[PDB]
Design a protein around this nucleic acid. Structure first.
Ligand SMILES: Nc1ncnc2c1ncn2[C@@H]1O[C@H](COP(=O)(O)OP(=O)(O)OP(=O)(O)O)[C@@H](O)[C@H]1O
Ligand SMILES: [Mg+2]
Ligand SMILES: [Zn+2]
Ligand SMILES: [Zn+2]
Lengths: 49, 692
DNA sequence: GCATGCATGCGCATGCATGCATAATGCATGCATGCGCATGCATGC
C-alpha cells in the first residue's frame, strides 16, 4: 500500500466491467453460474470440458 | 575446446570458486591494508548490494580468471557473485534477512574500441565503450523467481529463475498434470529493477564525412537511474545476440540485432568560512567584482546582477496584498556589446536557470502545451520555461523578436506570477515565482540619446514598467577602451589555442555563499528612516514635474526597499541600516535618470549630484571631466582640420574650474592616481597642461 | 432292485469386435495517430 501525490492530465470514459459471469453449453444447454471475477486488470479463461 | 565449455563443468567451477574466495580474503593494497575489509565494511554501513572489482588487481593476483573473463562473462560473473556472497555472509550473518544476493562489477579495463568497430568478432564478449546518453525508459519491474497459479486447481508452482534470453514456460502442473494455462502469482513473486538506455557517439569524436552511430544498453538492479539524458558515460558490458526475436524472419535478409548488457557505469567548515568572509568589511565589493570574469567593463551591470541574483523577500500581510521580492533585469544594447555572454554566465552560475530565445526554434518553449512527446511517445503536459524555473531564474534572448503568444504569456507571468492553462480538457493554474532577465536591441539598430527608452525599444510601456532595473549599453568610439577590449579579445584567442576589488571569491565559494544567504538570511526593516525617504520622494516628484516628463511613482521606492534588502543579504545583516538604503537609492536614481532624454537627463544629473555621489570616487568624476574635454577638443579638430592631430592637449585651468563647480579644489591625488596613468594621461607643470 | 452308462447342466478363463475418453497455442486484422507534403484561403500594408 502506497501513498503518492500527483496531477491528473487525462481521464478516459467510464466503462463496464463484469464481476460475476455465467456461461452456457452448446449441446445440452447446461449452465455454470455465479463465477467470481478477479478485481483489477485481470482476465478469465473459459473451461473446455 | 571453447573457454565456456571448460567453464561449464563442475571441477574447474569449484576450483575457480575457491580461488576467488582466497583472492577476496587475501587481497591487500600497496600499503598492506585489507582492501576488501574496508570495502565490505563501508558497504555494510549502508546496507548496499553491489561490490566493485578492478581488472588490474584481478589479473595481477590470478591470471587465468582475468584471461577467461572477456570470452565467458556470464558464468564467470555468476561464480564470482557466489564467492562474494559466501565471503560476505561469512563476515556478517544478517544479510540472509536483508539481501540474498550480491553483484560483482568490473571497474577498470583496457579501453575497448568505440561503437563503430563492434562487429561479429565481439559477440558474446566483454567490452567497454564510451558514449552520450539520449533517452531513458524509467524504472520497470522485471520478473525473478516467478510463482505460477494453476487455473484448474489452485496449486502454486514453485519459483522459477527468469533468464534474460527466453520467457519461462512451465511444463505441467505437478498435481493435476494439466498442460495449462497458467498465470503469475502477483503477491508471492519477486521483482527486479530494469531500465533501457540508448547511447550515441560523442559528436566531437566523429570524423568529418560520416555520421554518429548508436546502440542500446540495459541496466539492472542498482544501476537503474544512475545516468541522466544528455550526459557522457562509459559502460562495461556484454555484446549479446542470444535473445528471442533477434533474427529477422518475416521478410528480408537473415539479419541479427545486437544488444549490450551493462554492469557498471563511469561518468560544516564551509559555514564557518562563509561567516569569516562575511566578517570582512569589503565582502560586497568582492561579490560585485566576482561576477562575469570574462567580460570587461560594465561594472554597473555586474553590480545590478549581484542584487538580482541575491534577491529580496516577498511580503504578504494576510492573504490580501502580495508583494514580490524578485528583481527583474532588462538590458538594451547596440550590437557587439556582449549581452548574451551575461546570460550564459548567469545560467552557468545559477543552481536553477532556464535559457530560451524568442527568435525561434528554442530547445525549451515559452508556452505550455499538451502533446505526445516525439521521443518517449507519451502524452505529456509540457509547461513553459517560466513554470519550470520555480524559485529560479529565467533568461530570454532576442526579447523583441517574440511573437504575440510569447509576449502575452510573459506579461501574465510577470504581473500575476501564475500561468493559466485551458487546453485539451485540462484546466490548471501553475506557479511562476521566477526572476526574469532579458536582453534586446534598439529599433533602428543604434541607440538614440535624443529619444526616451520606450521610443528606442520595440517593447511596450506596460512590459517595461515590470522590470526593476533597466540597463543601456551604448557603443561609442573610445580609443583607450577599444584598445583594452581588443587586447582582451586577442589574449583570449591566443590563450585558448589547443597547443578596485582586492580579490574575487572562488565560484564554488560564491555558490555556497549564495545558497547560505538565501536559506538563512532574513533582514528586517525595523530601523528604516521614513523622513529622508519621504522628503527625497517629494523632491524627486517635484523636479520631475518641473522638467515635465516621466514623473516618478511609488513603485520605484518598493524596488529600492527590495534592493536594500538584497544589500542587507550580502553582508549577512539581520537588520537594515542606512548604508544599504543609500546604495539602493543610488541604483534606483541611476536607473531612473538613464531612461530620460538628453536635456532632462543632464538637468537631473546636475541637480541630484548629492545622492548619486554616495560611495563614489572623485578621481572617476575628474576622469569623466577630462574625457569630456578631450572629446570636445577631438571633435573640434576633426571638424575644422578634417583630420586628427598627433597630440591632444588641454589646459589645467578648465579642469580646475569644473572641479570647483563640483566643489573639488585639489587634484594632486588625481595626478598621482592610477586612473590617470591607465588612460595614458600626463601632466606638465612646465606649461600647466595635460597631455594625451 | 442294484449296478452302470450317460445325455444334461453349471461356473471362470481367454479372444475379438465395437465402443469410450482426451484436450491451448500461435498468428492475423482493423482502429488511432504521428510525420512530410502540396494546395489553397485569409489577412495584412
Ligand atoms: N566586453 C567584452 N568582453 C569580451 N567579449 C566581448 C565583449 N564585448 C563583446 N565581446 C564579444 O563580441 C562578440 C559578439 O557576440 P555576442 O553574442 O556576445 O553579441 P550580443 O551583444 O549578444 O549581440 P546581438 O545584439 O547581435 O545579440 C562575442 O564573441 C563576445 O565575446
Ligand atoms: Mg546575442
Ligand atoms: Zn454440454
Ligand atoms: Zn493444477
Amino acid at each position: 500500500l502506497v501513498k503518492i501525490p500527483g496531477i491528473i492530465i487525462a481521464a478516459s470514459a467510464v466503462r463496464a466491467k463484469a464481476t460475476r459471469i455465467s456461461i452456457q453449453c452448446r449441446s445440452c444447454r447446461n449452465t455454470l453460474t455465479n463465477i467470481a471475477m478477479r478485481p483489477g486488470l485481470e482476465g478469465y479463461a473459459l473451461p473446455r470440458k | 575446446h571453447s573457454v565456456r565449455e571448460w567453464v561449464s563443468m563442475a571441477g574447474p567451477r569449484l576450483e575457480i570458486h575457491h580461488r576467488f574466495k582466497n583472492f577476496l580474503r587475501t587481497h591487500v593494497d600497496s600499503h598492506g591494508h585489507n582492501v576488501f575489509k574496508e570495502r565490505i565494511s563501508d558497504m555494510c554501513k549502508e546496507n548496499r548490494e553491489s561490490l566493485v572489482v578492478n581488472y588490474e588487481d584481478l589479473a595481477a593476483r590470478e591470471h587465468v580468471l582475468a584471461y577467461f573473463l572477456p570470452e565467458a562473462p556470464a558464468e564467470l560473473l555468476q561464480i564470482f557473485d557466489e564467492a562474494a556472497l559466501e565471503v560476505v555472509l561469512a563476515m556478517y550473518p544478517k544479510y540472509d534477512r536483508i539481501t540474498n544476493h550480491i553483484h560483482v562489477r568490473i571497474s577498470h579495463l583496457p579501453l575497448v574500441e568505440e561503437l563503430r568497430s563492434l562487429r561479429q568478432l565481439h559477440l558474446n564478449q566483454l567490452i567497454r565503450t564510451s558514449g552520450v546518453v539520449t533517452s531513458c525508459t524509467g524504472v520497470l519491474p522485471q520478473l525473478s523467481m516467478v510463482k505460477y497459479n494453476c487455473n484448474k486447481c489452485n496449486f502454486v508452482l514453485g519459483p522459477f529463475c527468469q533468464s534474460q534470453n527466453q520467457e519461462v514456460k512451465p511444463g505441467s502442473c505437478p498435481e493435476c498434470q494439466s498442460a495449462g494455462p497458467f498465470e503469475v502469482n502477483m503477491e508471492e513473486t519477486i521483482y527486479q529493477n530494469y531500465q533501457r538506455i540508448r547511447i550515441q557517439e560523442s559528436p566531437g569524436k566523429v570524423a568529418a564525412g560520416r555520421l554518429p552511430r548508436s546502440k542500446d544498453a540495459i541496466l539492472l538492479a542498482d544501476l537503474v537511474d544512475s545516468c541522466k539524458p544528455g550526459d557522457e558515460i562509459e559502460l562495461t558490458g556484454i555484446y549479446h545476440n542470444n535473445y528471442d526475436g533477434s533474427l529477422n524472419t518475416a521478410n528480408g535478409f537473415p539479419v541479427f540485432a545486437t544488444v549490450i548488457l551493462a554492469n557498471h557505469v563511469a561518468k560544516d567548515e564551509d559555514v564557518k568560512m562563509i561567516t569569516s568572509l562575511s566578517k570582512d568589511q569589503q565582502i560586497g565589493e568582492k561579490i560585485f567584482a566576482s561576477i562575469a570574469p570574462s567580460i570587461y567593463g560594465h561594472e554597473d551591470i555586474k553590480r545590478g546582477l549581484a542584487l538580482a541574483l541575491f534577491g529580496g523577500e516577498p511580503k504578504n500581510p494576510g492573504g490580501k496584498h502580495k508583494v514580490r521580492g524578485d528583481i527583474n533585469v532588462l538590458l538594451c544594447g547596440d550590437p557587439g556589446t556582449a549581452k548574451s555572454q551575461f546570460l550564459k554566465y548567469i545560467e552557468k552560475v545559477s543552481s536553477r536557470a532556464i535559457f530560451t530565445t524568442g527568435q525561434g526554434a528554442s530547445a525549451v518553449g515559452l508556452t505550455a502545451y499538451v502533446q505526445r512527446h516525439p521521443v518517449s511517445r507519451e502524452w505529456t503536459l509540457e509547461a513553459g520555461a517560466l513554470v519550470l524555473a520555480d524559485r529560479g531564474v529565467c533568461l530570454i534572448d532576442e526579447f523583441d523578436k517574440m511573437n504575440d503568444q510569447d509576449r502575452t504569456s510573459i506579461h501574465e507571468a510577470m504581473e500575476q506570477q501564475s500561468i493559466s492553462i485551458s487546453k485539451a480538457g485540462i484546466v490548471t493554474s501553475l506557479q511562476a515565482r521566477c526572476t526574469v532577465i532579458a536582453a534586446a536591441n534598439p529599433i533602428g539598430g543604434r541607440y538614440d540619446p535624443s529619444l526616451t527608452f520606450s521610443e528606442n525599444v520595440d517593447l511596450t510601456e506596460p512590459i517595461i514598467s515590470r522590470f526593476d532595473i533597466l540597463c543601456v549599453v551604448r557603443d561609442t568610439v573610445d580609443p583607450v577602451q577599444d584598445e583594452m577590449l581588443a587586447r582582451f579579445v586577442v589574449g583570449s584567442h591566443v590563450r585558448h589555442h589547443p597547443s578596485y576589488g582586492v580579490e574575487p571569491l572562488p565560484q564554488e565559494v560564491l555558490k555556497k555563499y549564495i545558497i547560505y544567504a538565501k536559506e538563512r538570511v532574513h533582514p528586517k526593516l525595523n530601523q528604516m528612516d521614513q523622513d529622508k525617504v519621504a522628503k527625497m520622494y517629494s523632491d524627486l516628484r517635484k523636479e520631475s514635474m518641473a522638467t515635465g516628463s516621466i514623473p516618478i511613482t511609488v513603485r520605484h521606492i518598493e524596488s529600492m526597499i527590495r534592493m536594500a534588502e538584497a544589500h542587507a543579504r550580502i553582508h549577512l545583516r539581520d537588520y537594515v541600516i542606512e548604508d544599504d538604503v543609500n546604495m539602493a537609492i543610488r541604483v534606483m536614481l541611476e536607473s531612473f535618470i538613464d531612461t530620460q532624454k538628453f536635456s532632462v537627463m543632464r538637468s537631473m544629473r546636475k541637480t541630484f549630484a548629492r545622492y548619486l555621489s554616495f560611495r563614489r570616487d572623485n578621481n572617476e568624476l575628474l576622469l569623466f571631466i577630462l574625457k569630456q574635454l578631450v572629446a570636445e577638443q577631438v571633435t573640434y579638430q576633426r571638424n575644422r582640420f578634417g583630420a586628427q592631430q598627433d597630440t591632444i592637449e588641454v589646459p589645467e585651468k578648465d579642469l580646475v574650474d569644473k572641479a570647483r563647480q563640483i566643489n573639488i579644489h585639489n587634484l594632486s591625488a588625481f595626478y598621482d592616481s592610477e586612473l590617470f596613468r591607465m588612460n595614458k594621461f600626463s601632466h606638465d607643470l612646465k606649461r600647466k597642461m595635460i597631455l594625451q
